[PDB]
Design a protein around this ligand. Sequence first.
Ligand SMILES: [Mg+2]
Ligand SMILES: [Zn+2]
Ligand SMILES: [Zn+2]
Length: 164
Amino acid sequence: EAPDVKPWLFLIKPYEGESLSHFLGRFRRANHLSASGLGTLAGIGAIVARWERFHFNPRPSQQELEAIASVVEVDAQRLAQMLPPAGVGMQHEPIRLCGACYAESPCHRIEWQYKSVWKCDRHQLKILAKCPNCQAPFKMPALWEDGCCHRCRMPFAEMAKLQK
DNA sequence: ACGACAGATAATTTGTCACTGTACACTACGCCTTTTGTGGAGATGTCTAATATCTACGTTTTAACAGTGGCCTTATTAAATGACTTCTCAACCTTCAC
Ligand SMILES: [Mg+2]
Ligand SMILES: [Zn+2]
Ligand SMILES: [Zn+2]
């Protein structure tokens, strides 16, 4: 062993509005974990691959968030802030993006999936629901490694000027 | 007396020559034995490199398959089908109609 070392893992700081799908994707990339791997590591199994698609029948339970809060050092109350608050309706399929936010903070925001959200009040821009250059839909936020459209390679920060 | 002068005289050798005894008569280096150092085969003993044989050293290659790992969405309501469960399985009397 390395003497006086504590068993450790690569951590990531969650951004102020980062979605759980985006967060788990970064944590998985930081540790080169497959989606099945993190679920086995937390012991919740295939559930992680389901959450990364925003498939929330059922929602992330107290048990499973506290389980993920054992391998991720982020506490379960902060993990619950990566999800819609109680009774806020959300949509999983059309993945959406502000772009002007992504130039400031490279994360998907869970509020971009709310059924009540359509503009960024900070930027006063209509949030995108597909790539404005090539019309390809955005991939699940767990897969936003490159920070660009997977088809035409336009960076999300440039898509800010193609909004509203 | 003895012996001592010059010369006699009985030896001594030098030289002749008639006589005779003998070889020439072909007939020894030759017959035979032993040793002996040199020499010619010719049976026999001497003793190796080497071209294998003759397995093993074990070492690669295969394929079979075993184990790890990723993925796989989840809910409601209706229908069909197959099943399960539960419940039930009175009876005598009155009244008004020919
Ligand atoms: Mg839709
Ligand atoms: Zn914005
Ligand atoms: Zn594009």
